[PDB]
Amino acid sequence: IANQFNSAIGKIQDSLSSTASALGKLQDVVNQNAQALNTLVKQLSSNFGAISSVLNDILSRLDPPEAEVQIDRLITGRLQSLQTYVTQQLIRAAEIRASANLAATKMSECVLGQSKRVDFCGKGYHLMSFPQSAPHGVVFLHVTYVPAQEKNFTTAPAICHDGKAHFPREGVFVSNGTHWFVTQRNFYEPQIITTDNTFVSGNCDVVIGIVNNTVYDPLQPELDS
Amino acid sequence: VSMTKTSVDCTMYICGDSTECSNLLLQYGSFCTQLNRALTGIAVEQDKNTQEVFAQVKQIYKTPPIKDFGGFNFSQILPDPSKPSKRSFIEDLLFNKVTKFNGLTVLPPLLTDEMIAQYTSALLAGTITSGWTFGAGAALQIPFAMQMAYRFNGIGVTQNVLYENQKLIANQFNSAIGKIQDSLSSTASALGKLQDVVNQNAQALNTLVKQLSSNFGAISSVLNDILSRLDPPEAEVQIDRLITGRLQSLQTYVTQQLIRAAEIRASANLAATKMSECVLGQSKRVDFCGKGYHLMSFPQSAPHGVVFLHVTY
Amino acid sequence: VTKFNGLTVLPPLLTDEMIAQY
Amino acid sequence: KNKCVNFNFNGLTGTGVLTESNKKFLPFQQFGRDIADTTDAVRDPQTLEILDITPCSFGGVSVITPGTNTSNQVAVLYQGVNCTEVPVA
Amino acid sequence: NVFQTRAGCLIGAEHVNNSYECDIPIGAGICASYQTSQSIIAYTMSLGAENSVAYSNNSIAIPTNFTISVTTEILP
Amino acid sequence: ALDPLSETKCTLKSFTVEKGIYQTSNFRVQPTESIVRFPNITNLCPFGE
């Protein structure tokens, strides 16, 4: 686990260094603001129906009663430009505030503690995460537990020994073709079937697919010794 | 999940087939540019919702030819190969209950319905075989009797109940699925949440078209009449009135679409969260996957959305 | 990852250093 | 130069700071402008040289005050204004 | 190279029956990409390889190995 | 126009001001004088022609 983890962190440095587009999510916020600011400014050069876009010009062109007619067109149009800008900023602000609440939620479940949610901290079973500062944002490196290799085994829902169905207390029953072993779902660790690893409920005539085997009782050799 | 994709042309909408009206529109700058960029971003986000929601997996999963479901009947939830298009018996009902020349263009969806059914089929086929594993990692074969046994052990129910009452759990479940089919077939309002999306889009488009007939203080709403009647200097006055108002009409449309764009994306994020917690895995949250202790869910495709059938204890 | 018409840019309440110290 | 003034060059009117510029213009080149289509530089008609145009300093005024029940002492903040530009007030 | 689709008439793209991963999205499940003498081509967007998972009552697999992965997530 | 504190009350339209920072009338630098640079011109208009 020391090599897998350290080797994983190395790939993060190579990916972020080689691939500059992984941060495009943040670059969009910069581009959207640049277009809004650039556009908002360029609207000053527009006539908006007026003879010219320069205020001192119209005041230095039309007479006082005639100028006000044209000046109103610039004020009217330029006014709508601000409304369009403010309207978009309020809407875009909702998308950022929604992301901020999401980032604050992840740090609580992912970073601070351990999250049991499915794929909330990223694919696989979440362990812990590393918060990292990013411009106008934040980066989360999530360490997860991903199973790799598996092997097909024979299983049975229950074991029958003395006539009472035996069920696993934890894990599942597996067999290599000879003896039935107890093992966890996430890894293969053969364990002998014992009364401590199984529970007694019902009989053998109910469970469907129950099989017969020898349940080892650790108390037998103790009583004989 | 997804909302209708619309592309409004602010060159034709404002000035129909008019050179003079067009020149007068250029004096207003980038207004026509902004209206296109805003609607363009919406169409992209509408399709982006399907990518974050419908597709939870990079692999296609299929069921074996021999069906042992452990007493449950999935014939209703799984696609029917005998139909001309791939869909299940439930999706068949979901699609049936839910259903211009002025420069309004309806863009096609990025994801076809047939490809949506393949997403659900992969999720359904996985839960039948791989259980909760395929979403958390490589597909891991598990027997069904073992699948339900673990799902009960997680909610505090010792698996003794499953193996002993398996016959009873098979009758309650199968009878429950039958009630879903009867309810969806008889009740057409269950999808009304999806019908609202269609009604709102039609209302916005209908209004946007009707605004063209408004005078906006002009002598006549037809540009050809203004040009065929008034002199060039007098026509500019009447054309400016029509353009000014038609600009406000487009600003009203885009404003409403941006607001609804934030609503549809919020719903899509919720759908993606449920598929992760409720469908792929088992969630311990209270009343997130539905009342009772959540066992597992069946994703089902619906028009411009998705349906979740939550099996609870 | 990276005017004269009266548009003002407000400085952030917290410097890039403070967010790094969190 | 180096001061806020109202400049008129061959009919080009505006208010801003005028300074010497290392920016080069072509012989026919006189009135330039920035991305905002506002003149950022000009050539003096009589004597030929390039002048950099910057808008005179401006910004908001924020008042830092405690509660009225506390005291009337106030501190004024000049947004984006250098200390040497305050006396202009 | 004049073909018709549900989105409209597309000129300058060759139709390849083989399904690949979407590169340039178009519509109606159609995408374009630059590949093999290379030129633009049109194809249906593939959902990935078809994986048929064996299923049986007595068959189960226990993962024999694991891998620690580090996922990178960014938020504004 | 009295002092900055009054400008705060004047901005908030209230005779009581709670602790905090508030924005007031913006500051702007005015020009020191007018600059006029024109080319040399002498002869009268062609009133003869």
Residue numbers in the entry:
A (entry chain C): 923 to 1147
B (entry chain A): 729 to 827, 854 to 1067
C (entry chain C): 826 to 827, 854 to 873
D (entry chain B): 535 to 623
E (entry chain C): 641 to 676, 689 to 728
F (entry chain B): 292 to 340
Give verbatim excerpts from the published study on this entry:
The spike (S) glycoprotein of SARS-CoV-2 mediates receptor recognition and viral entry into cells. It forms homotrimers protruding from the virus surface and, once engaged with the host-cell receptor–human ACE2, undergoes a substantial structural rearrangement to fuse the viral membrane with the host-cell membrane. A large number of SARS-CoV-2 neutralizing monoclonal antibodies bind S protein, especially its receptor-binding domain (RBD), providing a basis for vaccine development.
We carried out cryo-EM study to delineate structural changes of the Kappa S trimer, and obtained two cryo-EM maps, including a one RBD-up open conformation (termed Kappa S-open) and a transition state (termed Kappa S-transition) at 3.2- and 3.4-Å resolution, respectively. For the open state, the angle between the long axis of the up RBD-1 and the horizontal plane of S trimer is about 72.5°; while for the transition state, this angle is 44.1° with the RBD-1 appearing less “up”, and the other portion of S-transition is in similar conformation to that of the S-open. Moreover, the population distribution of the S-open versus S transition is ~49.1–50.9%, in sharp contrast to our previous findings that, for the WT S trimer, the S-open occupies only 6% and the S-closed about 94% of the population. Here we determined two conformational states, including the S-open and the open-prone S-transition, for each of the Kappa and Beta variant S trimers. Compared to the WT S (94% particles in the tightly closed state and only 6% in the open state)8 or the G614 S (35.6% open, 26.0% transition, and 38.5% closed), the Kappa and Beta variants display a great population distribution shift towards the open state (~50% open-prone transition state and ~50% open state, without detecting tightly closed state).
